[model samples]
Target: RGLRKEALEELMKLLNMKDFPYRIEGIDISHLQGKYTVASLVVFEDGFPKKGDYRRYKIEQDHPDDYESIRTVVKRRYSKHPLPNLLFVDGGIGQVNAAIEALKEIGKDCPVVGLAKKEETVVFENREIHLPHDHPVLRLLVQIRDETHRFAVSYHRKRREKESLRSVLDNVPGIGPIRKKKLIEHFGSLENIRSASLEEIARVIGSTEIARRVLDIL
Candidate 1:
C-alpha cells in the first residue's frame, strides 16, 4: 500500500494533477488497418485494475485514423458513463488532444495524458514527460497502458474471428446464418470446431449429415 501511494503521488506530481488520481482510466485503440477498429477502457483504482469497470467500444469509423477513433470512443464513453480522475491514452500528442477535444465537445473536462510508444514518453498538453524505465510512475502508467492494449487487442481479435468464422462456415452446405451463429456460439472458434467429434458437431447443429460434410470440408 505504501509503494502504491508513492507511485500515485509521483504520478500526480508528474501530471500536475491537483487531486490524487483515485480512479484512472486508460484507453487504447486496436485495429487491422481500419478493420475491426475497437477501443478498450481499463480502470485502475489506487494503482490496481478494477476489472469490473472495464469497457470496450467498437469504433464506428472505417478509416485508419487513430485520432478520429479516439474522439469517437471518448465521446461515446463519457457521454454515457462518468469520467475518471485522469484519462490515459495509448499514443502521442494527437491522441491525447483528441480525447480532450472530445470531452470538451461533450461539455466535460478531465486531465488527459498519452504514452507515446516510440519513446514511452508521457504526453500532456504541449509537454512531454520522460521518466526512468524503472521509475514507479512509469511502471504504473505502463501497467495501465498495457492492460488497456491487451483488452482492446482481445476484443479486436474476437471481432476478426467472428468475421472469419462467418466466411468459413458460409462455404459449408446446409448451414445458414442461424446454424453458423450456433456453431460460432457453441464452439467459439474454428480450431475448437475442428477438434470436436462428429457427434459433438451433430449435437450442436442437429444434423449428422451436415456435421460429416463440415468435417470433410474443414
Candidate 2:
C-alpha cells in the first residue's frame, strides 16, 4: 500500500496533476492488418483494476488509422462517461495528441499520457521521457498498458474468428455450411481448429477425408 501511494504521488508529480490520480483509464488499439480494429478501455482506481468500468469499442472504418481510431474512442467515451483523473494511451506522441484533441473538441480537459512500446517511453504533450524498466511509474504505466492491450486483442480475435473461419474454409473442398457450422461450434476458432488433431477434427465433422483436407489446406 505504501509503495502504491508513493508511486501514485510520483506519477501525479511527474504528470503535473493537481489532484491525486485516484482513477486512471488506459486505452489500447488492436487490429490485424488493419481489419477488425478495436479499442479497449481499462480503468484503474488506486492503482488497481476496476473491472466493471472496462469497455471495448469496435472501430467502424474498414481500414482504420491509429490516430483516428484513438480520437473516435476517446471522443465517444468521454462524451458519455465521466473523465478519469488520468488518461493513458498505448502509443507515442501522435496517439496522445489525438486523444487530447478529441477531448478538446468535447470541451473536456484531462491529463493524458501515452506509453510507446518500442522504447518504453512515456509521452506527455510534446515531450517524451524514458524511464528505467524498474521505475515504479513506468511499471504502473506498463501494467495498465498490458491489461489494455490484452483486452483489446481478445476482443479483436473474437470479432475476426467467425469471419475468418468462413472465408478460409470456404475454399476447401467438400466442406459446406453444415460442416463449417459443426467445426465452428466444436473448435470456436480457426486457430483452435488448426491446433486440433486430425482425429479430433474428424470427430467434429464426421469425415476423416474432409478433415485431412481441412488440415492440409489450413
Candidate 3:
C-alpha cells in the first residue's frame, strides 16, 4: 500500500539494481552559521520509518561545510552500526562522494545514491534519474529527505537551548551539577524555576540562600 508496484519496479530497474532496498537509510546535516552542527540518519524499513533506529549526531567540524559534516557523521555511524542495503545522502555529487570516502576509509561499501535539493532528482552511479513530480518513488525520497532534515534541525535546536540554559545556570554560586539537575528536574524549565517561590525551590536544592540567589538571577 505504501509504494505502488509500478513505482517500485521502476526504482529497481533505473540503476540496474536487482532488488528492492528494503533496509534503506537517508542521511542529512543541518546547521546555522557553522554553529550547532548536527547530522541525522533516518532509517526506512520496508519503505517506512524505523524511528527507534534513527540517530542524530552533533558534528564537530572546523568549518560549516556539508561535505565535511557528512564525512564525519557517516564514518562515525558506520563504525557503530551495520551498513544498510542502500544509502541516500541529502545532496548531489559532493555530499555523496563524501559519504563514499568515509565508507572507503572504513573498508566498507554499499549502494549509495544522492538527492539534489533544487532539481529533486536522484543521482546514481551511472547518471541522474528524473521522475515525474507525482511519481511514487520521488514522493518516497522527498519524505526521507524531509524527515532527516527535521530530525537534524530539532536536535540542533535542543542543543542550543541546552547551552543557553547552562550559560545562565553555571554562573550561579553554590549550585553545582547535582543541584542544577535537581532544580531543573523539579521545576521542569528555567522559566518555571524563575517563577517558583524560594521555599518550593529550596525543597529540591536544599538551600534557601541558593534558592533566593536563583530567584534573583533567573
Candidate 4:
C-alpha cells in the first residue's frame, strides 16, 4: 500500500519532526545458546525497507546481553555514521534508553522509540503509550520492527551453523585447514561429512589413517 496521510501526520507529531523525505530505522538483536549474538539495522525510507542500506552487526560482548548488545551495535553504527530520522528499538523503554546512551557516547542523538512486541505499545521517554490497534503509524512501526527481527534471526542462525560446522571439523585430529576444506567441499555439509564412509573421507583427505581418526571423532 502507498503511504497514508494520517500515518504521516501522526508520526510527525509524535516525533515532533516536520521534515520531509524522512527515514526510519528499526534495530533488533538475536542470539541463541549464548552464541552468535547479533543485531540488525533495517532502514525504511518513507515507510519501506531500503534493502541496500540493511546492515547486520556482531556484538562482541563475549556473551549474550541484549542491552549491551544494543549499545555496542548502536554506537558502532552511529559513530561517524549517518543517523536515521527516527530509530525504533525492538524492546521496551530500557532498550530505547540503551540506544540513547550509545548515541551519547558518539556525541550524536536522534529521535528514538521502543516498540513492544507483546502488547504492541510505543515507549517514549519515561512513559508507554498504546496506540489504536489499527493505527497506521503503529502498523508502520511494527513492520520495521518485524523486519529487523527477521534479519537478525536469519543472520544469527546462518553464522552459528557455519561456526558449528568449522568447530566440528577442527576437532578431527590430523586434519589441517586444507584437508578440512577438502572434506567439506567433497561432502558439501557437516551432515554429509559425518555420514560419509571412511573410504570416501580417505579419498578426499588422501590418507586412510587420517580418515580413521576423523571417523572415530565423528
Candidate 5:
C-alpha cells in the first residue's frame, strides 16, 4: 500500500513541476481486521518523505469499520497537527467524504480528495470522476499517496517483526530505553552493534562515559 516504484516516479514529476506549490500529506489506516487499528500520516515535502513529520496514531473508536476508523483518525490527527497544503486518502468516495466531514467538523478548510484503487478515478464532489490517466495532476496525487502509504506500512511491519528485539537491551547495565533510543537515533542503523567499541558507540550516541560502560554490558 506504500510507495511503489511507479508512485515514486509520479510524485517526483509533480514535485519538479513548475507550479506545484504545496506540501502534501497522505493519511492511511491499517489494522488486522478491526483490532489494533493504527493510522499513519506521512508528509511529502517537495518530492520526498519528510521523515520527522511522519506520524502514527493508535485509533480509539467504538466502530471497527474503515469509515469509523478513518473518521476518528482524522479528527484526532488534525486536532494537534499543522494544516497541510492538501490531503489525499487511500480509498474511494467513502473515505474521501469521511475526510471532508472530519475537516469540516474541525472548521479547518483545506483541499481533499480520495484516490480510487483498481482505476484512476478521483472520488470527490459526491461522484466518481475520471481524470486523464497520464495527467500530471493525477500523477502527483498518486506519488504522494504512494510514498506515505509505503512509509507507514513499512514502519508498521518493521515494528511488528521486531517487537521482541525492541527492549532486550533494557536489561543491560547502564542502559535504559531512552539511552537505547539515543544509540539508534544517532547511528541511523544498528549495523555496528556487535563490533562497536565502548568509546566509539558512546561518541556516536552523544552520551557520557557511562554509555560506553553500558555498551559493554548490553
Candidate 6:
C-alpha cells in the first residue's frame, strides 16, 4: 500500500508540471547506410508542437555517433536561435546527459528530459522514473514526444535523401553550387539529371571539362 501510494504521489507531482509553459525541442539524426548524416530540432510547447520553430541541419560529423550529432545540433541552434525551455531528446538518459553536456558548454543550462522508445520511462537529470499507465502527464508527454519525433524524422529523411542523390554530383571534383544549380535548373528532375550524358551535363552545366571528368566516375 505504501509503495503504490508513493508512486501515485510522485506521478501527481509530474502531472502538475503540465500547467507550466514548458517548451520542448527534439533532436534526431538520420543517414542512409551511414553515408550522409543529417540532424533536426523540433520544438513543442505545453504539449503542442510549435511547427514553425522546427529546424533541420546537415552535419560535418565524421561518424554515426548520436552524441556528436547532438552536439552539432545544439551548437547550431544556440549559436543562432533562442534556446527552448526544455530539450526532449528522442533517446533515453544518455541522450539527456549528452544534451546537458552540450548546453553546459554554452554556459546555459535548461531543464531537459528524454523518452524511452521501447519502455515507458521518463528520464531526466540522471534519474529514470516510470509513471502509471494512462497517467495524464505521461500521455501528454507521449503526444508531444511523438509529434516532435515525427517532425524531426520527416525533415531528416527528406534532406537525407536529397543529399544522398546530390553527393554523386558533389563529388565530381570541379562541380560547385552554381554549376550544380544550373545543371538541375536546366535538366529539371534527377531522372533527367541522370539521363544526360557527361558531355551533355557539361554542356548544360557550362563546365564540360569537369563534366567529362565526372563522366569518367559515373
Among all windows of 10 consecutive residues in model 5, the one with the lowest summed lDDT is: 12-21
Steric clashes per prediction: 0, 0, 0, 0, 3, 0
Tens-place lDDT per residue, model 5, 1-218, is 33344554554354343334356788887775545677788887655677898888776544457777788878888898876766778888888888888888998876666778778776665687677888765776677667767876785554543342345455566666676776655543334454677777767656767665655555
The regions of model 6 sitting more than 4 angstroms off are 1-19, 156-218
Those runs of model 5 whose alpha carbons end farther than 4 Å from true positions after fitting are 1-21, 60-63, 159-218
lDDT of 4 by residue, 103-127 (tens): 8888897878888768899888757
- State how far residue 158 of model 5 sits from its true place (Å): 3.0
Expressed as tens digits, the lDDT of each residue in 98-153 for candidate 3 is: 88888999999887888887899988774677888887778777777787777766
Task: List, residue by residue over 176-214, the lDDT tens digit for candidate 1.
Answer: 778788988887777788889999999998989888888
- When sorted by lDDT, best at the front, the candidate numbers are 2, 1, 4, 3, 6, 5
Candidate 1, after superposition: displacement of residue 115 in Å? 0.6
Point out the higher-scoring one by lDDT: 3 or 6.
3
> Model 4: clashing residue pairs?
none
Q: How many backbone collisions does model 6 have?
A: 0
| Best-first order by TM-score | 2, 1, 4, 3, 6, 5
Per-residue lDDT tens digits for candidate 6, residues 110-215, read 7777777678788877888788787655665576566666766675454554555477677778678888767655754556666777778877767779888666
TM-score, one value per model: 0.71, 0.75, 0.67, 0.68, 0.61, 0.61
Choose 4 or 6, whichever is better by TM-score: 4
Give the per-residue Cα lDDT of candidate 2 at 77. 89
Tell me the deviation in Å of residue 45 in model 6: 3.4
lDDT of 2: 0.85
* Residues 40-64, model 2: lDDT tens digits: 8898888888889998887766676
Which candidate should be chosen as best, given lDDT against the real structure?
A: 2
State which candidate, 3 or 5, has the greater lDDT.
3
lDDT of 3: 0.78
